[PDB]
Symmetry: C3
Subunit: 414 residues, 3 copies
């Protein structure tokens, strides 16, 4: 009777060992991870790259008759028949100018047009200060995006050293006073695809390793306010397969030195436009030929829109394992104060109304001298699995790997 209960105990015990052991086996083969949050204090933080565009693509005073002829339909100033839109709510001077530029009696490169006709940082930048020291417009690098001629501070490209800040708070960062030049905005007399009612700027704070994608990743800043942007640096570490989904091999594209999800997106877009239309848009990089305004209308735009809708699987961009992101909180104060409106108006030779409708101050800084780290960490390593299987194997039947080998011997002999 004792040997019978002993045998049943060995059978049931081996069953428990079976289900527990297979439990840990399957759990290990889920390849699970868990998240580790940490906050790291530092004596220094590398200041990010800040790209901003004016919401107005190009200045009205810099457009010429040839530009109206070639790109008049694309810029939405002229119709398909090369005629002025509805004369409702048209400035007399503006309408006379446009009719004169559209004489088209006895009368082009897209990047020339954007580079020359776009808003000049030398006129927009009323003041610049970085860590309390003056900066020049030469510090901003020209980048061409969907919004037109845009500028990036602390771009760190072409070998320029990335800036550091050794103090946190509103004073110790980038601080620019900009004039959005609302008088240069395209007159809107009729509904158009490009028609916009907004006035202000659009900003993206990003690491120097990734290109700007300001039409998607940007936030707005309105004139008449000083907006503060508190940034918090975040360092993210992901896991490759089979744990997570990250790109272990960087596989950097020829266009950009460092791989980024954004750079992969605009690379896919450029390649698609080159394949379908044999030309590239203004924002796209490389040495490829730029599109003509006729090419824009009949090929480029429908190809991009069709690329978004028709085949979303075609452009699959994996996320890199090391990603530096910047968190940001916005707040505003009124500019200018009643005590300062007169001095600004006289300093920049403008009316007090103009200052009210055209001046914005951007204040970008790190809240404190620290950065957060978010790391995906493996939850079950092979040592832990062998340890658990060994522990349960020794608790339930007390066997070992040598024991199973010896059982194969005794079974083999008999």
């Amino acid at each position: 009777l004792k040997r019978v209960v002993w045998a049943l105990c060995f059978m049931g015990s081996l069953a428990l060992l079976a289900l527990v052991c297979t439990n840990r086996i399957q759990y290990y083969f889920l390849y699970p991870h868990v998240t580790k949050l940490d906050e790291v204090a530092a004596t220094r933080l590398t200041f990010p790259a800040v790209t901003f565009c004016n919401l107005n693509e190009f200045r009205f005073s810099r457009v010429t008759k040839n530009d109206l002829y070639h790109a008049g339909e694309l810029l939405a100033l002229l119709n398909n028949r090369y005629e002025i839109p509805d004369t409702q709510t048209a400035d007399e001077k503006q309408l006379e100018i446009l009719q004169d530029k559209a004489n088209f009696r006895n009368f082009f490169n897209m990047l020339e047009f954007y580079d020359r006709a776009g808003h000049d940082i030398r006129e927009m930048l009323l003041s610049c200060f970085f860590r309390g020291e003056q900066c020049s417009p030469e510090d901003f690098k020209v980048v061409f995006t969907r919004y037109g001629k845009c500028y990036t501070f602390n771009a760190g490209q072409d070998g320029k050293p990335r800036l550091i800040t050794m103090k946190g708070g509103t004073g110790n960062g980038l601080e620019i006073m900009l004039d959005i030049q609302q008088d240069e905005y395209l007159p809107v007399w009729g509904e158009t695809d490009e028609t916009s009612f907004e006035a202000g700027i659009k900003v993206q704070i990003h690491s120097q390793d990734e290109p700007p994608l300001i039409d998607q990743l940007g936030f707005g800043v309105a004139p008449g306010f000083q907006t503060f942007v508190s940034c918090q640096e975040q360092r993210l570490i992901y896991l490759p397969p089979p744990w997570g989904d990250c790109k272990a091999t960087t596989g950097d594209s020829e266009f950009y030195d460092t791989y980024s999800i954004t750079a992969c997106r605009i690379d896919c877009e450029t390649r698609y436009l080159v394949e379908n239309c044999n030309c590239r848009m203004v924002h796209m990089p490389g040495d490829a030929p730029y599109c003509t305004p006729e090419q824009y209308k009949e090929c480029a735009d429908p190809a991009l829109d069709f690329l978004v809708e028709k085949d979303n699987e075609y452009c699959v961009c994996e996320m890199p394992c090391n990603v530096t992101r910047y968190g940001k909180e916005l707040s505003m104060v009124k500019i200018p104060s009643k005590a300062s409106a007169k001095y600004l108006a006289k300093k920049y030779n403008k009316s007090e109304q103009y200052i009210g409708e055209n001046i914005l101050v951007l204040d970008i800084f790190f809240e404190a001298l620290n950065y957060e780290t978010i790391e995906q960490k493996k939850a079950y390593e092979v040592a832990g699995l062998l340890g658990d299987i060994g522990g349960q194997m020794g608790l339930f039947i007390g066997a070992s790997i040598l024991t199973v080998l010896e059982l194969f011997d005794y079974a083999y002999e008999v």
Copy 2:
């Protein structure tokens, strides 16, 4: 002498096995969990439900003499004695209109209902909605569903209720989302001539982005949007998975309420309020769902409001709402630009037959979108399972004395024989 060193080694080893084993056992009965954060890319994201209210509860031009009679004291337009309060800063025309509506001489009171009053006197979306765009294509006011909240007649875009299928977005960024130009109609706001608790100085709208599975709770979970700016809202979809007891505190059971199909903490709160008011005052407020009779303004004054305040103050034990295990939250970042530009002010004023002053002080543009086509997942994960517990106890039990459950069974064998 060797048997003494063996006895000491076995005793100390058995003690260490005791405290370490009880350590791992107690850790298991804490039922600990740790968090797994992940970011998942998707080719499509279901666009959320967007509820917005005007900060002004009802339009001044739509209020009638009967409304002043029944709900005049509640609407704060008339005093307790059915007479107009202090006329400070009163436009002659507006004050004459109100004085005419409050004549109450040989007046036969018509029947009055709170939901009728809010439904007709509230701001009409057909008048507020100057333009709507979703994914670059036009939307109708028919996409907006009428929802009654504490703020009055409010509207929910993409509510996904009453059999309408929920909208999706296949691209991220400012263009590819909801974008509505609204006229808040500041001319219809109730005149404020005397100070009161209900008096407010704000002008604009209030918006809540929420899942279609939960009803709006705009008085608590909404953010404000001011006229004169285009406000961008970047959203990040978050999928949360919690653990039930004894690991965490979540609602494991579906717990369907009579009022709402899917369980949500918001639905649990407004359900608790509805039940409390129905039992205490035998009437229901405007925002509450069900089939109960709505309160009369007398019931509002003498029962409903003090009943809700007393429910909030006396004890939270009556309404204890646990969070469901599967929760979809939407994160949002706000930014602003000025509207309209000088190049557009005249065109807007002429397009909607208003003065440029009016456009400047009444037009707001709301742009709601997903920053990118991905969603975050936050999952509570169990940290110590019974297989791992048995593995650790077996490992240490085998390390210190090298015994097994069969070994302890044999020692109990000799104990039974003894």
Copy 3:
């Protein structure tokens, strides 16, 4: 032949046991942690402390002839030669006041104190606070406690100091929190007639929401609020628990500061600054606490500012502040509505005896509240404790060779012979 294959199995098994065992040992000695996020519903929340400053440091109408004499150069009202700068784009009356105040002819100076000057010249809460409400009941200016910061005379609601009990809120949403209507008094702002480093063009207030256990740090940790809007601030209470060494880097000890009862990273920062300024310049600025003598504007000019700037870069290793293990933080989301409505603009103008222009450029309403009655917890949790190490080592030690600590002790016993 059987003993040879057995020997190969025992050798490979002992090698694998070696590398796996050293693996778990090294993983334990990394002292790793992982994070536990949780959300807890609550019936009550302790309302935080709210500090706000006017962006204008001191009122122009309260500055006196003696103040101009001693601190005229420091306040940027007077030039290096104690003379008014260029009068370009200066209102005739506005400049007349200053020219009369800066006469300095047959003027017999009187004693001067920087903290008296800020306390008397700063914006008075009794004039700024147009209305106050907490949980729907009225509050007085006496509820705000005076704190001196780099921005000047500032105020803290629900400071919980001097024996006052901390306030709680039992409901979430816009109504059920602090709600103040403020007049920033833009007419009292310092005139800006000439370019200077100290010149600023902003108008408004700056707010910091913080725990009562920490002093404000508004020059670094504050956000702005603009006039002409009601700004809603939704707060989310976060409770954080960190690990001390060797797992993480937190304050294991109480860390008693001389100036503050409770330790906070901010209190550590202003402590480092105050001590440094007392050692190098023998005086403290207005914002600094303690019992040292306050600096004179000459001391400010020739010692204090360059000493602080030298402290930032040269001694960046010198001020190291460790983070406390238990920290209550408040997260915030900002949104705005327009104030006043056309239906209320004139009523406000007559209620406060001001023009509608003034109301438009001077009135702001701040609405601070909890989004919901819950709090998040973020805890660093030890990932590998010694019990788990011993369990894993025993499991693998028993799987590969089937040995125990008694087995190795017996092997050393036989080796002893």
